[PDB]
């Protein structure tokens, strides 16, 4: 989904 | 978000991970105190006095990120070559620090509420009471029920009291119409009486996931509403000005065409469509296409958020 | 879900995989008896006596998990760097354990049903008879057929007896109405007579895939039904209470508005909509938007499951 | 699907690719004759007589698959760590063989049609003529045209003769109704006259992409049609048997309800829906839900194929 | 799009990146001047005089891409094993040159518009004025307003002259009908007066993202329109010729069936459908299926573009 | 109106 975990958590 | 990195010119040491040799400056290891590699007290056990090397019979692919933590001076991230469990097992062994481990994880009576002590019955009883209250409400709106409603409200008040947060707000809302009991005030309180259906959020997990998704995508919901507002205004104005040139006008005004524009954008369907002329039909076709596009645009983000929350929960 | 790892202090050995050197002491290999590396008997052939070094002329990127399987003491997790075929042969070559291989599989007369020995004609006849029975059913519902139905039923019974599971249940069901033959019971049996269409699951592969997907998505289906139920109840209540202030009420009661709520949530379209006032129209727009969102939320999980099952089958 | 791998007991050599040392025996090299490494003639240049090493100043991560060709004896998959261009040059350098490159590639006058020689004017004229023919048709069906139709057919047959494959089949079909010209036969030929619109496949690229996707998605198209057929039959039977218990029968027979089932499953909308009772409304709600699910099931295969073809073309 | 690779026969040097040894020709290093490795002056400090090697205490997994730039002689691309920030730091560490890093970035008064200096109040006032103008327009179309419309136009033109792309074009358009003020011309100007709703593009970021997505998906929009046109024509012809065999013909002509074809393709719903016979119903079912398919086809490209732009912004 | 919001993955 997100390559670098963009906008992960909050 | 900013970190410090070692600078070169003393003594260079070699670290062996199951045959993979790593050469690092002692200054790089000394940046982070404590830890296995940070201090020599807990490195003598793994140090080889013969070959002058430190041996760690572990997984070789995971040592690059662990070493890079010293190299980056604070930046720790799991490379996409290994599962989460294998990376997790590594960090405790090297003991990167409680502040480092938990921060990395972020990157990844009163018996009633709990579902145990064989009191699950209480939860089942509450769910049955909620369903019964919904059924009695719907049947009361049909062309007695007051006693059952009183019993349901008594149970709701007792449950809220023994518990005594959005769930608490819903619980307190569920009884305000009953304790309260112009015609507009009566109409609105009878309407807000329906919020008893939201009391299922305590017991249902999918409802909680949906609520979390709605909370986490407020910007996306606002953008979707904004796009629908722009579309309905534009297309209602277009169709009204297209059909203003006829003696018998299907749409009396732009606000009258808001419903037609909304149902065409959403592809619900207005119904009868014959009296509208050719220009109105062209505007309606454009409105349908634009509605499909503008509703298919922002929904995927909410869908992905819901999927992520559901997978995290399960 | 717990595994053990060798701890440091005996003798260390070196493993060579196409030039890539691996260092590991004997206790890690001694953790797993048998296998190519666990016992010395099956590894002395690949040992080089002059260099005191084990040589393995194999692929270097796939050996990392092989060593980690010994390192992790049972946790054999595939690395995503290679195709499945190369990793399949690598584990067999080391004979890491017959029981060990099995868990990796899920980690990644009576001549009638088997479509061979020319039994393909017997199948074709079964499909033709099923289609003929469906056609005769639809035709007898139009404003003789009894003989054709009798032939279809006797063929079904003969097939069931020859074969003598959900398919078996469907086959038994397909003849129960005919063997049976208040008005309600007659209507029920006539309705359940349609279950003959499900007999195509034996021959159709896509129908089997759909059935497996439905079996594997029961939670998703339940969540979808729950969301639609909540939305329908809420919006029916909203529209009924919005229209309760008019002399000519389009909706007599909340249950009366259930059909309108369902068709608006599913975007099917109610049809005639003019008598509804402005508040009802606002509630309808909100219902349409919420229905689009609610339908869009849990579908791309059943969709993914169906795609996975279809690709696995094909 | 099967290949042979070298087995040990003679002579072994080392390959040094910019510091990444690879050690393989000559038997592995000798399995593939020719090539850069198969014969000593074309690999002696890179050989270093001083260190007895083969030096290859190329990219390290791409050599794993190159050695795997010798390792597996005919099996080649690209490792997922490098772009396609990097590996394409890498394999071409070692000249694995024309059959090898082709295998890897598959695993990942008459001046009229060729749009050059500033004949693009011919293509523009053809597109304009096709559009004019479509317009002439759509206005000749309204409540002279024959001359323009004759001119369009003359241009079509001239282009066909000059050019003289389903596209050629469409070109043949586009003139058959005109050259031909019971009432049913006349209606059929007038209908098949519309296939002039498909002549745009010659010029448009998106139309060709759609045609290729439809050809490559025949299985899921058939599956979608089968699912629609099953759902329509089931729900038509259910609604007919649920509603037939009243004096006023909205549906005369099961075939009568096929259109309603189709529009409900596809969410088009039947329209007026009042006379059907509560059981029919429940059946309709279930039909709408099941139709949404069944039409959402197979289409994320068709769309994926279309996206792949579109990206390949562009 | 063409690059040159070093060809052997003169000296070879070894690079030690945190234990990972690399062997590369000196001519490869000399292909790119300047930089850390291009000249001995900027790399002599990092050199190890006793081991005859260069010791780089940096991230070893990312050195392969750095070496490939010299190996390929002009090609730089990050492999998918490290975050982009790590690679961005590494290339700055070696200082490949701004002439090379520049093409890598895209590989993956006048105080009014700038929302700072306590000017956000001006933006709020502008948004309120735009909303008020839209409301007055919608209300005056109902069965005075002129003064409020004049005030809104005065504010719009004041902002335009104070500030004096496409947003400026929209701002100019928003006052053209007012400054102008056959029946067709009046209808056209009253219709184009609605363009005031597009002035919200200046303030709203999501609407700007939508505009960028529309600009970047013109080919897909055209393909969608073309597919809809083809399907509409085909199914209108089919249904008209199916229902032309009855005295009471529901559709008078193929153009009359265009609306029915559009609503069936888009699954909106024609409404009354009883008089059409069995052949027309079959044609309608086929039209509904084909509409669902042909609309679901080209959408998850506009969707992908919108998602990309939203994540970027 | 908007359930075909698919993506990649699936393998
Ligand atoms: K619809
Ligand atoms: K609809």
Residue numbers in the entry:
A (entry chain J): 2 to 11
B (entry chain B), C (entry chain A), D (entry chain C): 83 to 91, 96 to 194, 216 to 250, 278 to 298, 310 to 326, 357 to 489
E (entry chain D): 83 to 91, 96 to 194, 216 to 250, 278 to 298, 310 to 326, 357 to 488
F (entry chain I): 2 to 12
Which text from the study accompanies this structure?
The N-terminal methionine is deleted, leaving an alanine that is acetylated and interacts with a pore-lining isoleucine residue where RNA editing regulates fast inactivation.
Although the density corresponding to the N terminus inside the pore was weaker than that for the surrounding pore domain, leaving open the possibility that the density arises from an average of alternative conformations, the N terminus adopts an extended conformation. Lowering the density threshold of the map for class C suggests that the N-terminal density was an average of two conformations: one dominant and one weaker (especially the region of the terminus containing relatively featureless sidechains: AcA-AAVAG). To address this challenge, we modelled the N-terminal density by fitting the first residue and those with big sidechains (L7 and Y8) before fitting residues with short sidechains. We also observed extra density entering the chamber through the window formed by the linkers between the cytoplasmic T1 domain and the S1 transmembrane helices that we attribute to a second N terminus. Although mutations at Y8 destabilize the inactivated state20, their effects are modest, and in AcA-EI Shaker, the second N-terminal peptide in the chamber displaces Y8 so that it is no longer near N482, suggesting that any interaction between Y8 and N482 is weak.
